[PDB]
Amino acid sequence: GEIVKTVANTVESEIKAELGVIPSLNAVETGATSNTEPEEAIQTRTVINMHGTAECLVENFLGRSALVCMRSFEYKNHSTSTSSIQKNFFIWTLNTRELVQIRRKMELFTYLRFDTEITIVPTLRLFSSSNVSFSGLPNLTLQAMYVPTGARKPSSQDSFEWQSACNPSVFFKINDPPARLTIPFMSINSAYANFYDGFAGFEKKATVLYGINPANTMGNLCLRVVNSYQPVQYTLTVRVYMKPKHIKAWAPRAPRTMPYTNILNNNYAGRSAAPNAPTAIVSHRSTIKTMPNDINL
Amino acid sequence: GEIVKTVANTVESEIKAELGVIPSLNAVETGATSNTEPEEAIQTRTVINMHGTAECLVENFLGRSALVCMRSFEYKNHSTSTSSIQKNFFIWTLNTRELVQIRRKMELFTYLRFDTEITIVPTLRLFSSSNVSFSGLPNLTLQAMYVPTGARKPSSQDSFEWQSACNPSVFFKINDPPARLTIPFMSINSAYANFYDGFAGFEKKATVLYGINPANTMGNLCLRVVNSYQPVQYTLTVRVYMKPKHIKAWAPRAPRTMPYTNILNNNYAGRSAAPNAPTAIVSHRSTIKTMPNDINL
Amino acid sequence: SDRVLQLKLGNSSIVTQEAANICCAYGEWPTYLPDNEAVAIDKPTQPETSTDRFYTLKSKKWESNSTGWWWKLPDALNQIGMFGQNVQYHYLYRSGFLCHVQCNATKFHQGTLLIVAIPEHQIGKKGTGTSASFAEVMKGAEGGVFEQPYLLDDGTSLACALVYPHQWINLRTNNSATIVLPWMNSAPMDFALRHNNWTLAVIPVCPLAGGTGNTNTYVPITISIAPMCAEYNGLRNAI
Amino acid sequence: SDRVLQLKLGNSSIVTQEAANICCAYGEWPTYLPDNEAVAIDKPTQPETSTDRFYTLKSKKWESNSTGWWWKLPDALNQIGMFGQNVQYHYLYRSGFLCHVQCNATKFHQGTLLIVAIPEHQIGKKGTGTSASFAEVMKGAEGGVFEQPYLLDDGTSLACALVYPHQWINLRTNNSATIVLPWMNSAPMDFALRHNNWTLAVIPVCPLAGGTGNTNTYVPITISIAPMCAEYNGLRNAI
Amino acid sequence: GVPTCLLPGSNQFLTTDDHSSAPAFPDFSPTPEMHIPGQVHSMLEIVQIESMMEINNVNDASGVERLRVQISAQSDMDQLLFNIPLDIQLEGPLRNTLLGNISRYYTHWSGSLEMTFMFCGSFMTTGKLIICYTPPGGSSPTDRMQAMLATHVVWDFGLQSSITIIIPWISGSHYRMFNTDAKAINANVGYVTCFMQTNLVAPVGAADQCYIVGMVAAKKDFNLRLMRDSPDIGQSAILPEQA
Amino acid sequence: GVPTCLLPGSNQFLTTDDHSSAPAFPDFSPTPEMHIPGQVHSMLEIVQIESMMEINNVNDASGVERLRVQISAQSDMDQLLFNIPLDIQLEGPLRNTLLGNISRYYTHWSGSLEMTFMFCGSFMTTGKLIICYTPPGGSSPTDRMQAMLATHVVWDFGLQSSITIIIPWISGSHYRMFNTDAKAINANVGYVTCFMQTNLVAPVGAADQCYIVGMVAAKKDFNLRLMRDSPDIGQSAILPEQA
Amino acid sequence: GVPTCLLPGSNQFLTTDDHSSAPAFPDFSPTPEMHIPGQVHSMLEIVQI
Amino acid sequence: QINFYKDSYAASASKQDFSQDPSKFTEPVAEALKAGAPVL
Amino acid sequence: QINFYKDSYAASASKQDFSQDPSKFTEPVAEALKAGAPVL
């Protein structure tokens, strides 16, 4: 294990006709990748490469803020003949699989240990009714409440589970900067697992699903409009962004090829034809001797 | 190479009638500019000039914030009978040629290496409809997403390319200060080139255009209204400003004379008559012996 | 040193003369759980010779149209010998695995197998939302077959399976592959009956073939797995 | 030292007696690419004498109404001698150029040429949006003619062309101009066939004239260009 | 109070910003760190791992057929056997590789590549191949006389079953771009071509139609820049729980 | 928290502000610096380079005709040959120069100018000219007796083909302004005039009608201040891709 | 003035934040501390009962 | 790193660790392969 | 310069470099021109 701030330098190489030395030949059967250097495969010049590697660090590769949740509910009076339930909120059931870019990028490793910075971005639209005159978006107070595993969830906007005496909650308005906080590495294990070759229950029943991990039960995010209902219908759209920090990554995986279909498992249907079809990942060319983008003069 | 914080001082000079010394005569054929000093052309006094030069530094000359993009789209419901495309965004295809003041100023050098500070200034107007009652501009959330070369571009406001898990994106509202960030020196080469005497493709076809540089393929800026459509039509105008920082400049050019016509090449039509006509750059005077602004008493 | 190897664990000793090397997964050898990493406070049972020995599983016929085979550890050895009994009688297990795949053919035969140790290999099923059943996932010593080996039965790629600890059996060069697996879990111990740390997969990348008189030759593939530094915690009745 | 100059590169030697000086573009001499600035890792071919020598191009008749001529480097020398072959056979080239423009007339003749080495001279076309075709831009050793020399065929000015490395041939003072060009590119090497670093331009600022018996005199303009510290990388078949 | 001026960039959310934020679980004790083997510190470690190429990406090969190249005894000489496009950005053999997939998360790349070919015929089958890397500029070679003039390695089959060809970093620019225009000077790497040096010779007892598997990896002189969302994966809707 | 008061100038975007900003590409490695010849550190280096003047900016000269002054043998004595306005801000011979174009990006200027004239007749053609810089106050001189009383140089043609006249910094104020009012005390530099000292004498074999080319540059005592958008370039719309 | 940029998390109320705040009763003298038996420092002391 | 908060996990992106050991994945063999040597 | 961010390219306008070498453009001649001397 050596320090690599810049890519390897190239050393000047000479003609070499030596018996018993075959640097260009390797045995792939050992499981070892070819160790052949350019210096010993061709005649090379001295090159002092000052290309930096900091952008290919797993901290930089995974430590960008990515969307992990998009939920939209109608902000209005949901009350009817006999309901008494205001329903101006949503519950998510925390996960990192709903959006494929962060999922596929996280799924390039088996295990990840990171503290996560979260950023919530709310947006309002007036609901296009029969008689609706627009004149501006109310500066509503929102409450995002993390309900951990085994805590009572809210059933209404007006519920008293919103007390949040011990539940972590953040209050933030529409016209303010998007809410932000850091959640620590909060697994019962020493790393998060993107794949579980097993079951999360002690029973052998169908109801006990394959792939579900007994460390991904992370609880729920409950977000409400704190303001009581307006005289008109609004649509609140909430976007939650995840930025992994202080990242450790283990056991790199084969990248996902087929499009995801759900968040409970890694099943696939594949696309009808190449690319990313079950029988053809790379698009077809005419023959093994055909260059599809051959430069013609 | 010497340090020049203040302009050159003037030294007192005397009468000089010396054979073999002709400081006022030069040979222009050598390619060298005249080396004749005022001290040796006329009788001068001692002057201690304390005029500073910091304002004529290329850092100061180019390192002002200049407009590089103005795009306006209609913020409304673009949906029809069968579209399902919201179209509340634009794509720019990054460049520095659309606006002539920054173009002509940058085009005074062949090569530039600078890190660039960008500032995005959004503005809304209500669309003047048949029945439109104004009462104020919604504090909309905007997303500017840099889509690098070879990345999937968004086709709609509601597209999932906006994930931006690895694409650099900035979220900023209307009533906030204008969004700002620094893009680094991001050329595949050691400097940006304002002119390319060549082609960017290996083929010799018409489709391969002259002047296009294979280092100006900088990707695209995709900017969206994050908020879903309002009940009324708004017009969002976005202004992007560029401030070069940490600037190195090489091979100063002859300044542009004819008005620019496009961003793909440096072609010209010229103005019908002087000034800046193809056959007359400077305006006409009656004769070579005529002073047009002659002071009369 | 050479192309010859003898593996000796307890009662067991395997010899090969057409070897390539020993693949130590992530350049690590299995070791016993230290105190600094220990969670379960009860004194663990460390049966060396009775568990840390080569268990040979039932062989598989390499066919011209063979898609490939996988064995999930420790599920493959959970109903075999004293490793199985210690699993049945304890809540928690920890062990590495020395896996040794064997395949004999003539110098006239051609064919290549990729032998992959995949950690936390979650099987994806083609053309359904329903996740794989207990039966499909837990096949024990008999192991399972690849339906989509091209996709590693994961919606991933066979192409990129070389990230994982792997060797090849190329009948030109090699008749045997050897992969040393260390403990691979986010936790120090686990429940053997409901989670598999590793999946040993044997995929034919180049098919088995011969010339005019070496076609339809009976060529089995034998797998021998040795638990390494096996530990057990939570002594209870047998499950 | 004086108004006399001998240039000697390989086989070649040029002498002049009515010189002005040598113009070293941006006060620099061409040098070989160092290791600290090197990108292409293959060992480069440095043919000194076979490439770094004066190639004399076809002459041009200086007329009373002559607009001016340009030659784009390395395009001018890409189908000439061993410089051309090394270009045709390699992906990458790097070289400086010692350019030497020659024009003889009598002491009774009058006329002045500006000889400009313009870096990255992108030709602008008058009265169209269509960019210049491959034919119009790539004319090789024959070179091209100025349609709008006043605008440097760029929408710029001939007036301000003295930013660029330049000399004059003033028939009073001078019969020859000499400009030493170093490597001018944002990259250390380039593809010779699809990009020109330099454009040597010869523009008559004052027309060629004589008195009563020196009118319509045949006065050619000869250009000799010597590649300096030529390097080539990416040995392949010839293009 | 502290004299204050809110600058441009105030109240903005940048997805690439690097700032400390409010801890939601104050004084929370995270699980003790435990050693796990195969820890990755850099993406440049993964691109250095060999991965198979779909050299046989043709509309007659299905699944595992696409990762092997059928090499046969020729009734001819000097003939081309197969080609490899080096357009990582475009749908080609290198796309679905560790190099391809992870480099495709970036826009700029520089450095030498290694491509290793494993021969999978019989111990009794012999042969000599010539694999050639042609730097860009013109057309892909179809004659061995033209290909031999570029960077190449002659491959003798034997006890060492695999050969490496180093595709050396030969470009004017410090970096190349993963651009949608393959024929662009910024993007084009050139061509890899394989010809028969002698022939494939197999005795009657051995099959005449053998296979070659091609692998590609990056060398230690390899770099990536300007991270982007990979075009490998797409999304038309929020992924549901079931469907 | 840190005690804070948002001052006037909070939430403002000033196009001339000097502040650090959020990096969009975190830990991005820019291309290594490479030596390129002709590096410019100051705009004052470019204004010191000679550039041709349109002395013949008349409605009968087209293109390259405008950059040369037709000097002829005179059947007279002491006669004025040509004038040069020194109004850089106004449409005059100095506008389309390196001095003009780059100084025209500023509002204030100070320092001495050099104007070099190259004679382009025959080696056999002789002559003596007197070029005079008249400081401002009154009318431009039309008689040599009046012009000779100001700063001047007498030019003998010969082996040295060019002459310089230093237009020396002669102003009450430390700076002059590039003002639209030419007749303003803040803006006016005065006049440059060229008269025949003797005559142009050419033998029969040589042309009688010769040419002079005028160049202008700044000296090392030259300064510019108060940057502005140049009036040289205009725009009626966003420049399209094609038209 | 002091150069300032309001970040994401500005203007937010987090119920688990740890910041000093404006004292409502300036220079208020709280009642002197008096010893009371059975002082609890940790909830882990009570679960041990 | 800077961190204005009490907890260490609240801190910004961690100080760049440029340690690389690709041998874990590229040469994970008991007996090391020597460069130029026939690796059989 | 100040810079509140990790990257060096994020910093404000660089510290004034007052180095001038106009000879690059004004006297780019092999043999230097001497002041007052006939430069032929």
Ligand SMILES: Cc1cc(CCCOc2c(C)cc(-c3noc(C(F)(F)F)n3)cc2C)on1
């Ligand atoms: C797998 C996997 C899962 C994770 C952790 C994801 C973090 O989950 C969250 C998210 C996305 C948001 C909040 C959250 N947002 O707001 C609040 C608050 F308001 F309660 F503070 N909490 C809390 C957690 C644990 O990391 N890997």
Ligand SMILES: Cc1cc(CCCOc2c(C)cc(-c3noc(C(F)(F)F)n3)cc2C)on1
């Ligand atoms: C020629 C030439 C081109 C350039 C660089 C121009 C910078 O281009 C931009 C611009 C103008 C804006 C953004 C940008 N604006 O917002 C975002 C973000 F939101 F994605 F962060 N990126 C990114 C780049 C590379 O410099 N010289």
